[PDB]
Design a protein around this motif. Structure first.
Motif, mmCIF file in Angstrom:
data_model
loop_
_atom_site.group_PDB
_atom_site.id
_atom_site.type_symbol
_atom_site.label_atom_id
_atom_site.label_comp_id
_atom_site.label_asym_id
_atom_site.label_seq_id
_atom_site.Cartn_x
_atom_site.Cartn_y
_atom_site.Cartn_z
ATOM 1 N N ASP A 95 24.144 -14.669 2.871
ATOM 2 C CA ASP A 95 25.566 -14.360 2.763
ATOM 3 C C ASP A 95 25.786 -12.913 2.339
ATOM 4 N N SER A 96 24.984 -12.423 1.394
ATOM 5 C CA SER A 96 25.108 -11.057 0.901
ATOM 6 C C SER A 96 23.723 -10.493 0.625
ATOM 7 N N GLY A 97 23.458 -9.301 1.153
ATOM 8 C CA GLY A 97 22.179 -8.648 0.946
ATOM 9 C C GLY A 97 22.303 -7.158 1.148
ATOM 10 N N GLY A 98 21.439 -6.407 0.471
ATOM 11 C CA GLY A 98 21.461 -4.957 0.516
ATOM 12 C C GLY A 98 20.188 -4.400 1.124
ATOM 13 N N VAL A 99 20.320 -3.268 1.811
ATOM 14 C CA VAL A 99 19.200 -2.597 2.460
ATOM 15 C C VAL A 99 19.263 -1.113 2.122
ATOM 16 N N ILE A 100 18.104 -0.524 1.840
ATOM 17 C CA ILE A 100 17.997 0.863 1.405
ATOM 18 C C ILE A 100 17.084 1.608 2.368
ATOM 19 N N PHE A 101 17.533 2.773 2.823
ATOM 20 C CA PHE A 101 16.716 3.693 3.600
ATOM 21 C C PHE A 101 16.569 4.996 2.827
ATOM 22 N N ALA A 102 15.368 5.570 2.851
ATOM 23 C CA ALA A 102 15.099 6.794 2.100
ATOM 24 C C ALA A 102 14.020 7.578 2.829
ATOM 25 N N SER A 103 14.402 8.698 3.434
ATOM 26 C CA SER A 103 13.498 9.487 4.256
ATOM 27 C C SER A 103 13.187 10.822 3.593
ATOM 28 N N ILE A 104 11.967 11.299 3.813
ATOM 29 C CA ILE A 104 11.546 12.627 3.388
ATOM 30 C C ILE A 104 11.883 13.577 4.530
ATOM 31 N N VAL A 105 12.959 14.339 4.365
ATOM 32 C CA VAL A 105 13.534 15.109 5.464
ATOM 33 C C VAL A 105 12.813 16.434 5.662
ATOM 34 N N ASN A 106 12.628 17.198 4.590
ATOM 35 C CA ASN A 106 12.013 18.521 4.666
ATOM 36 C C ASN A 106 10.525 18.472 4.933
ATOM 37 N N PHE A 107 9.982 17.293 5.247
ATOM 38 C CA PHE A 107 8.568 17.194 5.590
ATOM 39 C C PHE A 107 8.235 18.009 6.830
ATOM 40 N N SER A 108 9.197 18.165 7.745
ATOM 41 C CA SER A 108 8.952 18.943 8.956
ATOM 42 C C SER A 108 8.606 20.388 8.621
ATOM 43 N N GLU A 109 9.304 20.974 7.645
ATOM 44 C CA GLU A 109 8.950 22.312 7.186
ATOM 45 C C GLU A 109 7.554 22.328 6.575
ATOM 46 N N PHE A 110 7.219 21.303 5.789
ATOM 47 C CA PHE A 110 5.876 21.212 5.224
ATOM 48 C C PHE A 110 4.849 20.877 6.298
ATOM 49 N N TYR A 111 5.234 20.066 7.279
ATOM 50 C CA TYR A 111 4.330 19.715 8.366
ATOM 51 C C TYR A 111 4.055 20.926 9.248
ATOM 52 N N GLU A 112 2.790 21.102 9.614
ATOM 53 C CA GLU A 112 2.383 22.217 10.459
ATOM 54 C C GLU A 112 1.092 21.895 11.202
#
Length: 848
Positions: A674-691
Motif C-alpha cells: 500500500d505504501s513504500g519508499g524508494v531511494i536513488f543515489a548516484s555518484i555524478v562527478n565520477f565521469s570527471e574522475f573516470y579516465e
C-alpha cells in the motif's frame, strides 16, 4: 529393526572372518593336544586321539560350510553347531582321561579357551552365549570332581567357582565391548555417508546462488575494461495498463514466464543477462568472453524478443510489444559492494543504449551507428527518423549528431605394528584421550575413551580380588612378601578406581591443579605406565604366594591361567605391550619355576598365549576403527556447516529475510504494498574522475555504504541493487505510520556524510552523491527459477530514477506525496520548482 538387518549385513564379513579364524584355532589346538597325547599318553590312544583327528575333519567340514550360501543366511546357526560340538569334545575329554593321568591344568586350558571362543569370536546373542558358557562351565567342574582319580591325585569348591567367575566376567566384558564398537561404528559410518550425500546436493544450491548474481565465467573464481561489447535494452510497452486491474500474483506471473522466454532465447543466443530493471530487460553480448559476433546476437535476441512477445501475446492474450535499442562500444563490468552485490556493466555507452531504447518504436530494433558498422546486408536497414518522430525534445537533445537506424526483422591399519598408515592420524589418535579430558566431553556411549577406562579399571579390581581371594583360601602362614603385594595393590587399586570415577563423573571436588595432573595421566606414555602395572596387578598376586617350599603346584598354574587371561582387559592400551607382558609376566615366571608335567605346562600356556595375542589384536583394531569413524564423522559435520553457512549467506545476498521463508514454501513470491519508499543515489562527478584504476576507490565507497546497512538502526532498510554508480534502496518492504520513511531519510542523511568523509583521504577530488526520493505503491517479486533475482518496480520507482536524473548535488529531491508527511514531523525543507514527470504531467518537486 530394519537398520539392524543392514548392521548385520555390513558386519557380516567381520563375523564370517572371525568364525573362520576360530576354526583354524580349534583345529590347531586339537592337533597339538593329540600329538602330545600320542607321545606321553600312549596307554589309551584310540579312545582319546581318535576324537581329536575326527574333530579335525569337523573343522574342515565347518570350513566347507562357510563358502556355501546357506552359511551366509544362517551364520548364527552354524556357530551354535560348533559350540555344542566343541563343548561335547572338551567335556568328554575331561571325563575320558580320568603315565595314565593328566594334570588339571591341561583341562583348565581347554575350558578357558573354548569359553573365550564362544564369548568373543563367534557373534552370538548375549543371553545365549552367557547361558551356554555357565552351563558348560558348571558341567566341566562338576564332572571333574565326580570323576576325580585317587590313584594319581568347603573352600575348595568355592575356589573353582571364583576362578570360573573371573573367566566369564572377562569374556562377557570383552563380548559387550565388541558389540558396542561394532554398533557405534556402523551408525557413524552410515552417518558419514548421509552427510556426504547431503554435501553434494547442498553444494549445488551454493553454486546456484552464485550463478544467480554472477556470470558462469566469473563464477570460476575483479573488474575489466573489455572493449567491443554490444549492449541491449528493451521495454515492455503497455506494462502500465497491465499493472492496473490486475492482482500482484497474476502480474508477476505474466512477467515470470515472459522473462523465462527471454532467458531460454538468451540460452540459444548464448548471450548474457545482466539484470532486469522491472519491466525492462537489458543484456550484454561480448563480455566477459570475447565474442566476435556480439552485434548480431544482440539483434537476434532483439528480433527474437519481438517474436517471443507475439507468441506470449497469443498465449496469455496480452497486447504487448517490444522496444529494443542496441548500442555497441567499450564497457566496464565488475562486482560492487559486499552485500547484495551483482554483476553489472557501467559506462557512458550503456546509458546511451538505455536512451536509445527510449527513442525506439514498439516492435522495432533501434540500433546506433556503431552497431551498423558490424552489420552486413543480412538484415534490412532503415533510417532512424527519430528527429521527426519525437521532435526536438529534451530526451533527444543529447544524440550529438549520431545517426540512428532501425531494424524490423529478417582399513588403513598395518597388519604388523597395528598403527594407522597416515602418521597424521596416528599423532591425533595418541592424543585422543588427553583432548577428551581437556574438552570435558560428556559421556555419550559405552565406547567413550573415558568410560572405557572406568569399566576396565572396575573389571581389573574385581578380577584381582576374586583371584586373590582363592589364593588366601589355600593358606587358610602366608609369606610377608605376599602380604606386601596384596596391600600395595589394594592401595593402588582404590586410587586408580578413584581417579577413573573422577575422570568420568567430574565431581565438584575437582580443582585446577588436580585437573592438570589428570590431563597429564591421560597422555600416551603415562597411561601406559599406570595401565601396565594395573593389568599385571592381578598377575602379581599369583607369584607373590610362591616361596622356597613349592616342592600348590596345580593351583598356581591354574591361577596363572586366569592371570594371563586378564591381559585381554584394558583394550585402550597397546595390544603388543599387553600381549608381551602376558608372555613375560604370566607365563615366564611359572616356566622358570618349573625349569609329563613339564611338557604339559609349556603346551598349555603356548595355546593360551596365542589366543590372548590374537584376541587382543582383533579387539584393538576394532577400537582403532571406532576412532577412525570418529574422525571421519566429525570432519563431515564441519564440512556440512561450512557449506551450510556459505549457501545461507548467498541466499541473504539475493533475497531479504522476509522472502526466505516464503520461498521455502512456494517456488514463487509476490507482494503488493500500500505504501513504500524508494531511494536513488548516484555518484555524478565520477565521469570527471573516470579516465578500472579509478573504480577501485569507488568500490571502497560502495563498501563503506554497505556498512550502513550493518548498523543496528538501519535494519528496516534493505537495498535492492546497485546499478551504474547508483545506489538503490527501499524502506517499508518488511512492514508511527511512516516510521520506515523517516529512517530511509536517516539512511540518506548519512549517505553524503560518509561521502564527504571519504573525500578526506583523496587528493584534490571530491565525490558528489545526488539523491532522488519518492514514496508510493510499489510491487516486489522474485524472478527466475534456476537463477533467482529480486526487484521492486512501479510508478514510484520510475519517478525516483527520474528525480535522480533531474537532481542536484547532495540534495534529497522530494515529491508531493512525501511532503504530506515529511514536513509534518519537522524536517527542514526547501523549494526548487517543477520538472517533467511521465504519467503525471508537470510535478511539484522540492529539495531537503
Amino acid at each position: 529393526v530394519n537398520l539392524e538387518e543392514a548392521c548385520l549385513e555390513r558386519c557380516f564379513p567381520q563375523t564370517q572372518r572371525r568364525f573362520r579364524y576360530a576354526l583354524f584355532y580349534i583345529g590347531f589346538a586339537c592337533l597339538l593336544w593329540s600329538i602330545y597325547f600320542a607321545v606321553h599318553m600312549r596307554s589309551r590312544l584310540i579312545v582319546m586321539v581318535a576324537p581329536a583327528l575326527c574333530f579335525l575333519l569337523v573343522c574342515v567340514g565347518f570350513f566347507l560350510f562357510t563358502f556355501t550360501k546357506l552359511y551366509a543366511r544362517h551364520y548364527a546357526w552354524t556357530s551354535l553347531a560348533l559350540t555344542l560340538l566343541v563343548f561335547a569334545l572338551t567335556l568328554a575329554a575331561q571325563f575320558q582321561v580320568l603315565d595314565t593321568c593328566l594334570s588339571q591344568v591341561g583341562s583348565f586350558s581347554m575350558c578357558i579357551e573354548v569359553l573365550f571362543l564362544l564369548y568373543t569370536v563367534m557373534h552370538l546373542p548375549l543371553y545365549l552365549s552367557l547361558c551356554l558358557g555357565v552351563a558348560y562351565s558348571v558341567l566341566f567342574e562338576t564332572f571333574g570332581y565326580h570323576f576325580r582319580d585317587e590313584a594319581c591325585f568347603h573352600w575348595e569348591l568355592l575356589s573353582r567357582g571364583l576362578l570360573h567367575g573371573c573367566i566369564h566376567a572377562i569374556g562377557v566384558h570383552l563380548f559387550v565391548m565388541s558389540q558396542v564398537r561394532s554398533r557405534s561404528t556402523f551408525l557413524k559410518v552410515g552417518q558419514s555417508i548421509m552427510h556426504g550425500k547431503d554435501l553434494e546436493v547442498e553444494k549445488a544450491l551454493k553454486e546456484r546462488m552464485i550463478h544467480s548474481v554472477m556470470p558462469r565465467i566469473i563464477a570460476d573464481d575483479k573488474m575489466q575494461q573489455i572493449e567491443e561489447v554490444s549492449i541491449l535494452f528493451a521495454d515492455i510497452v503497455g506494462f502500465t495498463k497491465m499493472s492496473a486491474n490486475k492482482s500482484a500474483h497474476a502480474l508477476v506471473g505474466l512477467l515470470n514466464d515472459l522473462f523465462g522466454r527471454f532467458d531460454r532465447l538468451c540460452e540459444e543466443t548464448k548471450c548474457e543477462k545482466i539484470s532486469t530493471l522491472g519491466d525492462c530487460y537489458y543484456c550484454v553480448a561480448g563480455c566477459p568472453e570475447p565474442r566476435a559476433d556480439h552485434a548480431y546476437c544482440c539483434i537476434e535476441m532483439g528480433l527474437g524478443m519481438i517474436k517471443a512477445i507475439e507468441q506470449f501475446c497469443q498465449e496469455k492474450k496480452e497486447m504487448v510489444n517490444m522496444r529494443v535499442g542496441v548500442h555497441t562500444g567499450t564497457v566496464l563490468c565488475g562486482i560492487l559492494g559486499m552485500r547484495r552485490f551483482k554483476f553489472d556493466v557501467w559506462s557512458n555507452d550503456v546509458n546511451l543504449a538505455n536512451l536509445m531504447e527510449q527513442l525506439g518504436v514498439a516492435g522495432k530494433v533501434h540500433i546506433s551507428e556503431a552497431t551498423a558498422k558490424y552489420l552486413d546486408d543480412r538484415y534490412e536497414m532503415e533510417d532512424g527518423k527519430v528527429i521527426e518522430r519525437l521532435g526536438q525534445s529534451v530526451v533527444a537533445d543529447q544524440l550529438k549528431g549520431l545517426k540512428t537506424y532501425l531494424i524490423s526483422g529478417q582399513p588403513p591399519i598395518n597388519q604388523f605394528s597395528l598403527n594407522f598408515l597416515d602418521q597424521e592420524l596416528e599423532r591425533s589418535y595418541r592424543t585422543s584421550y588427553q583432548e577428551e579430558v581437556i574438552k570435558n566431553s560428556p559421556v555419550k556411549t559405552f565406547a567413550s575413551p573415558t568410560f572405557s577406562s572406568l569399566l576396565d579399571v572396575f573389571l581389573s579390581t574385581t578380577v584381582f580380588l576374586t583371584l586373590s581371594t582363592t589364593c588366601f583360601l589355600k593358606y587358610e602362614p602366608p609369606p610377608p612378601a605376599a602380604l606386601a603385594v596384596f596391600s600395595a595393590a589394594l592401595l593402588l587399586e582404590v586410587l586408580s578406581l578413584a581417579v577413573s570415577i573422577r575422570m568420568v563423573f567430574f565431581l565438584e571436588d575437582v580443582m585446577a591443579c588436580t585437573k592438570r595432573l589428570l590431563e597429564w595421566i591421560a597422555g600416551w606414555l603415562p597411561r601406559h605406565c599406570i595401565g601396565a602395572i594395573l593389568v599385571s596387578l592381578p598377575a602379581l598376586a599369583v607369584y607373590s604366594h610362591v616361596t622356597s617350599e613349592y616342592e600348590f603346584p596345580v593351583f598356581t598354574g591354574s591361577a596363572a591361567l586366569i592371570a594371563v587371561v586378564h591381559y585381554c582387559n584394558f583394550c585402550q592400551l597397546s595390544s603388543w605391550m599387553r600381549s608381551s607382558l602376558a608372555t613375560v609376566v604370566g607365563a615366564g615366571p611359572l616356566l622358570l619355576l618349573y625349569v609329563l608335567i613339564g611338557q604339559e605346562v609349556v603346551l598349555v600356556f603356548f595355546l593360551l598365549l596365542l589366543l590372548v595375542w590374537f584376541l587382543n589384536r582383533e579387539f584393538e583394531v576394532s577400537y582403532r576403527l571406532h576412532y577412525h569413524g570418529d574422525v571421519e564423522a566429525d570432519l563431515h559435520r564441519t564440512k556440512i556447516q561450512s557449506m551450510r553457512d556459505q549457501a545461507d549467506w548467498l541466499l541473504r545476498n539475493i533475497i531479504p529475510y522476509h522472502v526466505a521463508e516464503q520461498l521455502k514454501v512456494s517456488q514463487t513470491y509476490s507482494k503488493n504494498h500500500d505504501s513504500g519508499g524508494v531511494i536513488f543515489a548516484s555518484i555524478v562527478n565520477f565521469s570527471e574522475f573516470y579516465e578500472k584504476e579509478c573504480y577501485r576507490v569507488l568500490n571502497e565507497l560502495i563498501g563503506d555504504f554497505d556498512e550502513l546497512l550493518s548498523k543496528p538502526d538501519y535494519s528496516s532498510i534493505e537495498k535492492i541493487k546497485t546499478i551504474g554508480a547508483t545506489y538503490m534502496a527501499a524502506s517499508g518492504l518488511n512492514t508511527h505510520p511512516q516510521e520506515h520513511l523517516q529512517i530511509l531519510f536517516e539512511f540518506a542523511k548519512e549517505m553524503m556524510r560518509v561521502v564527504d568523509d571519504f573525500n578526506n583521504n583523496m587528493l584534490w577530488f571530491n565525490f558528489k552523491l545526488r539523491v532522488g526520493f519518492n514514496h508510493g505503491p510499489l510491487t516486489a517479486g522474485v524472478i527466475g527459477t534456476t537463477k533467482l533475482l529480486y526487484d521492486i518496480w512501479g510508478d514510484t520507482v520510475n519517478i525516483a530514477s527520474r528525480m535522480d536524473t533531474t537532481g542536484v548535488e547532495c540534495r534529497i529531491q522530494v515529491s508531493e506525496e512525501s511532503y504530506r508527511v515529511l514536513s509534518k514531523m519537522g524536517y527542514d525543507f526547501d523549494y526548487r520548482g517543477t520538472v517533467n514527470v511521465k504519467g503525471k504531467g508537470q510535478m511539484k518537486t522540492y529539495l531537503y
